[PDB]
């Protein structure tokens, strides 16, 4: 009774950039309570567990924070797909989750998976309706674009800043942000294809997140809806620069606001470490 | 350029109990900034790095949280000593730290180090002087014994409860506790040789700690000073039960309050995992 694991830095091509996730293989012998205890033991923002598939996919993936199981998270699933590429020749990988089966395209160089693209759940969205409270918490007077909250498992609010330097200058009051339950606050700035983001979430137990993969799809939708890109055009989103964990996420939303057909998010991943646990 | 590491559960004899620390070997090639980045990457409460000695010890140990270096911490040094026992036959280990050289006795069974005892810095102490504020934050009316704050690197406040069940019933207001800077709050209950503890510290970035090894020595002093044990008598301190990380710490203080000669803390440790990182 031992399990091998890898630590993947997701949305990075260099170790110690991007956002880490520990991926545990051959986890079918672990009861869920033990998966939870292991995720707590590692204390990474998420640990994932690779299980035999039950509905025709390649594998079933369970995602745990140190305190609870999650239905969906982008960077942990990206890292899981990249890690599993070391163990399959498949060009595509179908990972079963609580959101259904998530399709991944694996990208390789000489047998090593260096990147992947995923099709995300199509989000829903509406106005947050707490704008002055949120802006006060962030320390700014206004957003550029409408402050809207998106749902694809987790919930993501988007607040637009007028320049990248204004984004980097943010020093939010995290106590005030803690009154925004069950959501993450994503502040963004940029133009055209290239955007910068910073994510803050007391609700999700993070002062500032390096790479919020489940926010990248919704941000592409947000930018297309508010006229900064078209549906069908990709954006490059660079997150985590200010905290020294630069993370590059690519995202594209196809269709139109009223009839979205696909939400794609991709990025590189690199192995930081590999190990074995004693149970 | 790779480094091996182990995850040791300190103050435990069973994996997933006690308090984890990652121990990185052969770290002399790592600049301190990189040690800090690695400790952040792992996100364990502490990671330690094993370096060549500079003042006649066996090794020099650097202790990092995800955000800063620490001069002293008990469970990380305990785990480091136990981990290093896999690589030496020595009965005693002298580990250089910012507090000076810390002497460890290693305890083995068939070549495996299963426990260790350390001589801790002798603490200083005084009344906290914020009793009503602290008791309000904890949700209780009074302490049994004087509320005093001890210093041996970190700072530890001790608040006594009238029964173990009263200790387990505590649900502190962690926002109110956050006004207690640069210290940990240790609540305790028990009798004779056997004590229970719970530690809370927003200042040290933990809602509730499993095993606060640097608090065990000061608690023995506290109990001897306030007449519950004698100087020279050991106590058993069980921490972390309520959070499912039961941790057993043993402590003894020799001398008298005005002239302490030794503060000893010991416990078991077990390997949870072993790995290698790519830099
Ligand atoms: C600790 C915060 O972790 C985030 C929580 C929910 C969604 C994520 C993601 O989608 O990558 C995570 N990055
Ligand atoms: C995250 C909190 O970690 C504690 C910090 C300071 C001292 C410790 C110890 O002495 O074992 C640590 N347990």
Residue numbers in the entry:
A (entry chain A), B (entry chain A): 0 to 278
Task: Reproduce the article's own wording on this structure.
While an E45A and an E45Q mutant were found to be inactive in previous work, we tested if the glutamate could be replaced by aspartic acid. The reaction catalyzed by PhzF is rather unique and it is therefore interesting to assess if the enzyme can be used to convert substrates other than DHHA. Towards this end, we have investigated the turnover of various analogues, including ent-DHHA, the 2-hydroxy derivative (2 S,3 S)-2,3-dihydro-3-dihydroxy salicylic acid (DHHS, 18) and synthetic O-alkylated variants of DHHA (19–21). In contrast to DHHS, the O-methylated and O-ethylated compounds were turned over by PhzF, but because these molecules cannot undergo tautomerization, they eliminate ammonia to give the respective aromatic products, which may happen directly after deprotonation at C3 or after the-proton shift. Further, the finding that racemic O-ethylated DHHA (20, vmax = 3.61 ± 0.65 nmol s−1 mg−1 (kcat = 0.12 ± 0.02 s−1) and KM = 1842 ± 355 µM) was consumed much more slowly than racemic O-methylated DHHA (19; vmax = 41.20 ± 2.49 nmol s−1 mg−1 (kcat = 1.33 ± 0.08 s−1) and KM = 622 ± 56 µM) and O-n-propylated DHHA was not turned over at all indicates that steric factors limit the substrate spectrum of PhzF. The structure, refined at 1.71 Å resolution (Rwork = 15.0%; Rfree = 17.4%), reveals that the ethyl group occupies the position otherwise taken by the water molecule that our analysis predicts to be involved in the tautomerization reaction. For the tautomerization in PhzF catalysis, we propose a reaction mechanism involving a tightly bound water and E45. The active site of PhzF in the closed, ligand-bound conformation is perfectly adapted to bind DHHA and a single water molecule only. This is a prerequisite for the remarkable catalytic activity of PhzF, which combines an isomerization reaction that needs to proceed in the absence of water with a tautomerization that requires a water molecule to become feasible.
